[PDB]
Design an enzyme around this catalytic site. Structure first.
Site: not given
Ligand SMILES: Nc1ncnc2c1ncn2[C@@H]1O[C@H](COP(=O)(O)O)[C@@H](O)[C@H]1O
Length: 152
Positions: A121-124, A128
């Site tokens: 998955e891509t880091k956002l 948070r």
DNA sequence: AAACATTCGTTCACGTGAGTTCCAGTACAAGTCTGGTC
């Protein structure tokens, strides 16, 4: 006095903050004022871990604090040391400490996943947040348990 | 019949493996510190 000072800072009033601090100064000793300054700065440097304090307070307090994130409920429910909690799990309208991720070495990544398929998955990049929805009642909580519901 | 050599149970010394106590080093949790941004 601390509640008055905090609310009054939130209310954009300084004369009342000065009055409260003056009362605290006039009704305290040097050591008490030093400790009060430390609490205001939010650092005590007691040298004892928070985990140790929670463990001495009750057998199962770190888990409850992680699930709830409010010193009121932990202090209230866990009063008699003998009486414990049967099951502690995430509850509505109570912040829960988020689960983070650790550094990983690309070389042994498969080993870290027990030689099984995994998700990439891509880091956002950003805040948070966690959202609690019950009907049209919405609550938003940040990484550490601060309430950002007013903004969103 | 007497002297010398060989053998056997005994003794000491030295070497090797297993159990116990004390201490150096390591992985990780948590505290503490710090920088940048709006
Ligand atoms: N897709 C994601 N899922 C869960 N947490 C995330 C995700 N993306 C970013 N994060 C958060 O970002 C942290 C790592 O920082 P990085 O992004 O600069 C993680 O420990 C998470 O708290």
């Amino acid at each position: 006095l601390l509640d008055s000072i905090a609310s009054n800072n939130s209310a954009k009033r300084k004369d009342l903050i000065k009055k409260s601090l003056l009362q605290l100064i006039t009704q305290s000793s040097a050591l008490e004022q030093k400790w009060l300054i430390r609490m205001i700065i939010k650092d005590l440097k007691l040298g004892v871990s928070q985990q140790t304090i929670f463990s001495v307070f009750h057998n199962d307090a770190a888990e409850l604090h992680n699930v709830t994130t409010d010193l009121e409920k932990v202090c209230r429910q866990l009063h008699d040391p003998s009486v414990g909690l049967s099951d502690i799990s995430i509850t509505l309208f109570s912040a829960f400490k988020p689960m983070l991720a650790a550094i990983a070495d690309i070389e042994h990544i498969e080993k870290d996943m027990k030689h099984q398929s995994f998700y990439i998955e891509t880091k956002l990049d950003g805040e948070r947040m966690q959202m609690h929805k019950d009907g049209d009642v919405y609550k938003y909580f940040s990484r550490n348990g601060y309430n950002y519901t007013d903004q969103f």
